[PDB]
């Protein structure tokens, strides 16, 4: 049996990201003294398109406090920002759309985005276009914060972690029908070599486990265990349920 | 072309204002007005604290 495609993505030869036209990593401002005590202002000079990413980036330029220069950093644009806007980072920053505040200083029910997991990693959670997390609770005991991640799976993070206020720009993006195969081509050509995926049913018993047969069918069950080994895992991994759902949403 | 500028006289690479060859007219004009009025407005933000914080 041949080594199959989904195993083969991991040597990462042709399946890498296509990072040429990317403006930069979209990290937040490095947490320094001016941020965790007072606050600091930048002008956002140009908000600019990014390739592969859906949401636009934003050129927020801060003054370096320690030598006379300018440090120009790349935010994900919140929706509603504009060029020329002042952006105030810090613990005592006011709460307007685009100021990046620690989560220890926001009231509960505040809609933030680009929020950090551990404080000091510069922007991990809730970053794709149109997402946000919501602070639903605080905990002044051991200073934690109870947030709602965009998949609904709620989380408790440190309150020294930082998040920027507002939705992320590019909303309603996946509502348009990507009418034809060419648009999917020019979409995924600036991301990676994932496309076009051939079904494993069509291919051969060397090529895949769903191959073979004198009929296009799967053979055994398509759900494979979590504990099964790399190479078998081609299908619905560790699937607890399957099939089409019933009932109304917003589950308990 | 960028290296041609090395030969040519300075009057080809400059207009005689402040921020001459690098910012245009009106932008210079705007960063006077802004840079004036702000540091006039900021003067008021010291005489507010000489009146409010004194009357505390």
């Amino acid at each position: 049996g041949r080594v199959i495609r989904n195993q083969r993505k991991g040597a990462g030869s042709i399946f890498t990201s296509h990072t040429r036209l990317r403006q930069g990593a979209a990290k937040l401002r490095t947490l320094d003294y001016a941020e965790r005590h007072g606050y600091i202002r930048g002008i956002v000079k140009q908000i600019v398109h990014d390739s592969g990413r859906g949401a636009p980036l934003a050129k927020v330029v801060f003054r370096d406090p320690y030598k006379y220069r300018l440090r120009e950093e790349i935010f994900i644009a919140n929706e509603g920002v504009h060029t020329g806007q002042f952006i105030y980072a810090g613990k005592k920053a006011s709460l307007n759309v685009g100021n990046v505040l620690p989560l220890g200083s926001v009231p509960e029910g505040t809609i933030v985005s680009n929020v950090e997991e551990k404080p000091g990693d510069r922007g991990a959670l809730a970053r794709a276009s149109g997402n946000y997390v919501i602070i639903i609770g605080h905990n002044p005991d051991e200073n934690k914060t109870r947030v709602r991640l965009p998949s609904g799976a709620k989380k408790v993070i440190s309150s020294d972690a930082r998040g920027v206020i507002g939705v992320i720009a590019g909303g309603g993006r996946v509502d348009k029908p990507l009418l034809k195969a060419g648009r999917a081509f020019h979409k995924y050509r600036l991301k990676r070599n994932s496309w076009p995926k051939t079904r494993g049913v069509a291919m051969n018993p060397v090529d895949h486990p769903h191959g073979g047969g004198n009929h296009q069918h799967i053979g055994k069950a398509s759900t494979i265990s979590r504990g099964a080994v790399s190479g078998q895992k081609a299908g619905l991994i560790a699937a607890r349920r399957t099939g089409l759902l019933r009932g109304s949403q917003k589950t308990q | 072309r960028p290296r041609q500028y090395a030969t040519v006289s300075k009057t080809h690479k400059t207009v005689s204002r402040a921020y001459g060859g690098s910012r245009c007219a009106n932008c210079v004009k705007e960063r006077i007005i802004r840079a004036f009025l702000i540091e006039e407005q900021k003067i008021v933000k010291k005489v507010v604290k000489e009146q409010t914080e004194a009357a505390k």
Binding site: - | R17, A18, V28, K29, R31, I32, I33, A35, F36, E40
Partner: protein, 135 residues
């Protein structure tokens, strides 16, 4: 009401002297024969006196306090009139319409303006008019 009277400090916002502080010495509101627009004859300074310290030597003070003045006709739209003011009757009679064309007279006028503004920079009245507007 009429706030372009003959003592106001302005900041010139167009022309070669953009961003430099003048005073109006004689406003012409209605206009003139030429210049069919409200222009004021201004006297300003072109190089600023650089900031002297406790430790500059005697002659090194003098080279720091040199002032290069200028005279100009300027339109009202090219001025920011500010709330400041300046006692200008020292050289009120020097700047005129006769001070211009016949340009040899302008250097004799600039000498008078330079003498007056150095005599106000020494004994440092008008601290705002003598620091560089910075932008």
């Amino acid at each position: 009401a009429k706030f372009l009277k003959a003592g106001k400090v302005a900041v010139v916002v167009r022309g070669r002297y953009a961003g430099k502080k003048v005073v109006i010495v004689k406003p012409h509101d209605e206009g003139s024969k030429s210049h069919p627009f409200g222009h004021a004859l201004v006297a300003g300074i072109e190089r600023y006196p650089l900031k002297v310290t406790k430790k500059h030597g005697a002659k090194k003070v003098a080279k720091r306090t040199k002032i290069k003045p200028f005279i100009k006709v300027v339109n009202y739209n090219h001025l920011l009139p500010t709330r400041y003011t300046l006692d200008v009757e020292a050289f009120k009679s020097v700047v005129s319409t006769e001070t211009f064309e016949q340009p040899s007279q302008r250097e004799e006028a600039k000498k008078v303006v330079k003498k007056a503004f150095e005599e106000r920079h020494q004994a440092g009245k008008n601290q705002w008019f003598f620091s560089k507007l910075r932008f």
